[PDB]
Design a binder for this molecule. Structure first.
Ligand SMILES: Nc1ncnc2c1ncn2[C@@H]1O[C@H](COP(=O)(O)OP(=O)(O)OP(=O)(O)O)[C@@H](O)[C@H]1O
Ligand SMILES: Nc1ncnc2c1ncn2[C@@H]1O[C@H](COP(=O)(O)OP(=O)(O)O)[C@@H](O)[C@H]1O
Ligand SMILES: [Mg+2]
Lengths: 397, 398, 70, 58
């Protein structure tokens, strides 16, 4: 098979005070990018290589004709005829021409067919419809485990699930435990589930596929399951890979007897997702990560030990994790010496990582209100109740 | 106090004064880096895009063109009611998929004996004559199937179902390997048996266990497979499956999660085909069927006597059963030889067998966490603390 | 000849015409229109049509055999 | 093309009309001078709507 993807540039992020160590490293990166540009522009400047076979390729192209429609090879027959489905959904019993790679023909791979008198004239290993191409991550997110505060147990678990099998896995089969096929992160909103997925996609060595869950559902009949199948086929093809499906409850709700056609199609799409999850062996190097807020509303078959063994909990940050997050998000701020930040943490509340980030942003805004950028402690004091909107007083004492 | 919006001079002074001396250079450099990255990305191209072109000397381009100009494509369809042909009304109505349905006749190359209701047929495009029946073929490569002849799970690999395994033995071993006692007892061997219980109890492998000790091949058929994309032809599929069941000397046919089917045109077709295969095949045969489900949604027309002779409930494993499962799953992992599996089985009340396997997996996980090649009892304690339970029970109970 | 050409242009606006949605204007004379047959076509806008009346998602009658925005 | 299916022109990016209508092409006639009170609210909006857009440098 082919190899993974998601190329990223240098981490940099060693200096941040803009002390020309940043400038020197960035100038080195820019110099290398310049040599990229110049080298390829020179290579295209002189590169005469074409024709050669020509005639045989010309006549095979004439045989193929123009245009050529792509379909899905649903089934094969004796090695001259096959069953191919056009993107509309109609499949036909067609013939297979000699110049096709009989080894490449398998149920599922896209086949180039003749526009008139349909007949398999080619195989496309890179169909990758625009949607599933979009779901594949190209530029790694700039966030990383340095940006994540706390969640040390969560980071440990996610790395033990998706990284350790990717890196040296000998511990797994040495203990004989099958690697955890699939992991579901869950917790209250803005705890860091999507942030952890970003950090995983940063420090990665596999094709990362970001999905929205609600993205899978498609209007046309059978488009949903077909897209799910395409996504997982791309995952296997570019294995090792990580398939992140954020907001799994967009489809993961409890399965109930469908009545309307649309609900039947949703049930079909989830059934196909579950079937694809079961399809690949856990020994395979393709893992899935599903994040959600309403874990209690998920179907209790998606989270079966035979399908998703692990269940990572993302609890609201503790006081030490709260101060860790505050330190992280205040790194780029020019805080004064009067600020302590301890009063905000000590206040018994339900701050989250998102809440703390917003508190820092609003403190910066309040400082900008006073025409300053040093950000006093009073700025944080105001910002805390500015962003934290909304037990009867002395009932409990 | 009315706060003042920033003015133009305010904005201009904010961007300066309290700035790092290298702001312009660094920001500009980052911008050029991003621009150069996009430049490289757009200019690097796509490359092949290499279509499935066979190596030369395998090409019969002359014959390929001959086929292109001679042979014709056929749309496939699911043939429906025969309209009682009797050689004078050979028309059938066929549904070409999401396209329409047409009442058509046969091509001269196919006899009506080859055409019957519910088989995929390839037909032309204007007369829509059924040109060739298209059996969906049978192979373990497609879908999932029995994919097993002599399972590697033995009677020592099953625990916690002693009464259940005994009942299963009476079901399958006694008529198959001891037909003489049923014959001279003058009693029909159990034609049908159902194995109901919560998922993860172990049901499947239990049958698989007896499938190894019944000296017969095991058959795994998933009801969701019958109800998912492999719907329609599935009837014919199981037809062929039942057909191959007849071919073999003895088949342990078992359907996984029949709830997906037991509770829908093609689904009903598969059901009635199952009814015909069971009620039609002679009960004296040796391909006895094992039925299991999680939701005792089964149609009333099924468990009528003569189709399901016995029912077996697979309850959650008991202390002895749970500790047996713990030991069984510990046999396959590197642990110490002094693990109190009775302790753990006590610590997992009302826990499914799959839950026990996951508990062992998490014990190995914790062992890996400390990078210890041998899992400890502490590791299993943390594993059960994590998996099981998903002050109150210690400050009141003692 | 101008009279004959005007007659021909007017005749191209005869009936029947298929209804579609004026999705997007591309050039001064060509647009993208979503014909209610369920299909998007890159077609040519007839000159006499008031350009200011061409707003997105507006219902437009198109020639039956050419989909030209009539 | 007609039925040859030959790429013969590149058109602007695909936006289906259902969202293409959601642009405010015809700006409404409502000024802050027509809004009584809400001065604090207007400032709080402006600190999020156009201040980040006009000058992200701060
Ligand atoms: N532990 C943390 N350390 C630092 N920042 C954090 C942490 N947890 C959350 N954040 C901040 O919260 C922001 C939003 O978090 P994220 O997108 O991961 O939410 P989530 O918990 O997955 O919630 P939801 O799925 O409900 O949107 C992140 O951009 C990040 O800045
Ligand atoms: N009696 C048993 N003996 C051995 N393993 C068992 C037993 N019961 C359950 N298990 C464990 O439970 C897991 C899942 O069982 P499975 O047969 O898939 O459940 P179901 O009966 O719902 O199909 C298996 O991996 C097996 O290790
Ligand atoms: Mg999130």
């Amino acid at each position: 098979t082919k190899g993974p993807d998601a190329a990223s540039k240098l981490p940099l992020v060693t200096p941040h005070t803009q002390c020309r160590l940043k400038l020197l490293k960035l100038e080195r990166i820019k110099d290398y990018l310049l040599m990229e540009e110049e080298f390829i522009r020179n290579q295209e400047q002189m590169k005469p290589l074409e024709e050669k076979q020509e005639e045989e390729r010309s006549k095979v192209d004439d045989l193929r004709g123009t245009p050529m429609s792509v379909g899905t090879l649903e089934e094969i027959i004796d090695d001259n005829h096959a069953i191919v489905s056009t993107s509309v959904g109609s499949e036909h019993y067609v013939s297979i021409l000699s110049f096709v790679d009989k080894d490449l023909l398998e149920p599922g791979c896209s086949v180039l067919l003749n526009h008139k008198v349909h007949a398999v004239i080619g195989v496309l290993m890179d169909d990758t419809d625009p949607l599933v191409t979009v779901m594949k991550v190209e530029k790694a997110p700039q966030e990383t485990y340095a940006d994540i505060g706390g969640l040390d147990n969560q980071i440990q678990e996610i790395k033990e699930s998706v990284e350790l099998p990717l890196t040296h896995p000998e511990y797994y089969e040495e203990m004989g435990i099958k690697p955890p096929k699939g992991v579901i992160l869950y917790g209250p909103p803005g705890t860091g589930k999507t942030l952890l997925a970003k950090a995983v996609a940063n420090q990665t060595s596999a094709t990362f596929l970001r999905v929205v869950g609600s993205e899978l559902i498609q209007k046309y009949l059978g488009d949903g399951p077909k897209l799910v199948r395409e996504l997982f086929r791309v995952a296997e093809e570019h294995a090792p890979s990580i398939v992140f499906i954020d907001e799994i409850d967009a489809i993961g709700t409890k399965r109930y007897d469908s009545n309307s056609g649309g609900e039947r199609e949703i049930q079909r799409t989830m059934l196909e997702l579950l079937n694809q999850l079961d399809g690949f062996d856990s020994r395979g190097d393709v893992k899935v990560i599903m994040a959600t807020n309403r874990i209690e509303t998920l179907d209790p078959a998606l989270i079966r030990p035979g399908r998703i063994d692990r269940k990572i909990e993302f609890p609201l940050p503790d006081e030490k994790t709260k101060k860790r997050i505050f330190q992280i998000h205040t790194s780029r701020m020019t805080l004064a010496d009067d600020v302590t930040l301890d009063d905000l943490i000590m206040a018994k509340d339900d701050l989250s990582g998102a809440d703390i980030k917003a508190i820092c942003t609003e403190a910066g805004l309040m400082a900008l209100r006073e025409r300053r950028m040093k950000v006093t402690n009073e700025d944080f004091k105001k910002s805390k109740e500015n962003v934290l909107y909304k037990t009867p007083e002395g009932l409990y004492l | 106090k009315p706060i003042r919006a920033l003015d133009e001079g305010d904005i201009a002074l904010l961007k300066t004064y309290g700035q790092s001396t290298y702001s312009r250079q660094i920001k500009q450099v980052e911008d050029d880096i991003q621009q150069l990255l996009k430049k490289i990305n757009e200019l690097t191209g796509i490359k092949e895009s290499d279509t499935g072109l066979a190596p030369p000397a395998l090409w019969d381009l002359a014959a390929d063109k001959q086929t292109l100009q001679s042979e014709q494509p056929l749309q496939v369809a699911r043939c429906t009611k025969i309209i009682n042909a009797d050689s004078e009304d050979p028309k059938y109505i066929i549904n070409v998929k999401q396209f329409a349905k047409f009442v058509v006749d046969l091509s001269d190359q196919v006899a009506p004996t080859d055409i019957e209701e519910g088989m995929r047929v390839g037909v032309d495009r204007n007369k829509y004559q059924i040109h060739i029946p298209l059996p969906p073929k049978i192979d373990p490569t497609v879908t999932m199937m029995q994919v097993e002849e002599k399972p590697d799970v033995t009677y020592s690999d099953v625990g916690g179902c002693k009464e259940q395994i005994e009942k299963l033995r009476e079901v399958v071993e006694t008529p198959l390997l001891h037909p003489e006692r049923f014959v001279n007892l003058g009693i029909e061997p159990p034609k049908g048996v159902l194995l109901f219980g919560p998922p993860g109890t172990g049901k499947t492998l239990c049958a698989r266990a007896v499938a190894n000790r019944t000296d017969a091949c095991f058959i795994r058929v998933i009801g969701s497979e019958l109800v998912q994309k492999y719907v329609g032809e599935g009837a014919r599929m199981v037809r062929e499956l039942f057909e191959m069941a007849r071919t073999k000397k003895a088949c342990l046919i078992f359907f996984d999660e029949i709830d997906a089917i037991g509770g829908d045109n093609e689904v009903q077709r598969t059901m009635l085909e199952l009814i015909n295969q069971l009620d039609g095949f002679d009960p004296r045969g040796n391909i006895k069927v094992l039925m299991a489900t999680n939701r005792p949604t089964l149609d009333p027309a099924l468990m009528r006597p003569g189709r399901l002779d016995r029912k077996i409930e697979f309850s959650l494993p008991d202390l002895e059963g749970r500790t047996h499962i713990f030991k069984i799953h510990a046999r396959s992992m590197s642990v110490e030889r002094d693990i109190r599996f009775e302790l753990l089985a006590r610590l997992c009340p009302n826990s499914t067998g799959a839950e026990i396997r996951s508990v062992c997996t998490e014990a190995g996980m914790f062992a890996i966490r400390a990078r210890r090649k041998i899992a400890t009892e502490k590791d299993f304690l943390e594993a059960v603390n994590k998996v099981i339970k998903s002050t109150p029970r210690y400050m009141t109970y003692n | 000849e101008f009279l004959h050409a005007q007659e021909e242009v007017k005749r191209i606006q005869s009936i029947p015409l298929v209804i579609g949605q004026f999705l997007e204007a591309v050039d001064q004379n060509t647009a993208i229109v979503g014909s209610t047959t369920g299909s998007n076509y890159y077609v040519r806008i007839l000159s006499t049509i008031d350009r200011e009346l061409l707003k997105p998602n507006a219902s437009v009658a198109l020639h039956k055999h050419s989909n030209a925005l009539v | 093309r007609n039925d040859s299916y030959t790429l013969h022109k590149i058109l602007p990016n695909k936006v289906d009309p259902l969202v293409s209508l959601m642009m405010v092409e015809k700006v409404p006639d409502s000024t802050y001078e027509m809004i009584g009170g809400l001065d604090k609210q207007i400032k709080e909006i402006k600190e999020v709507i156009e201040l980040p857009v006009k000058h992200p440098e701060l």
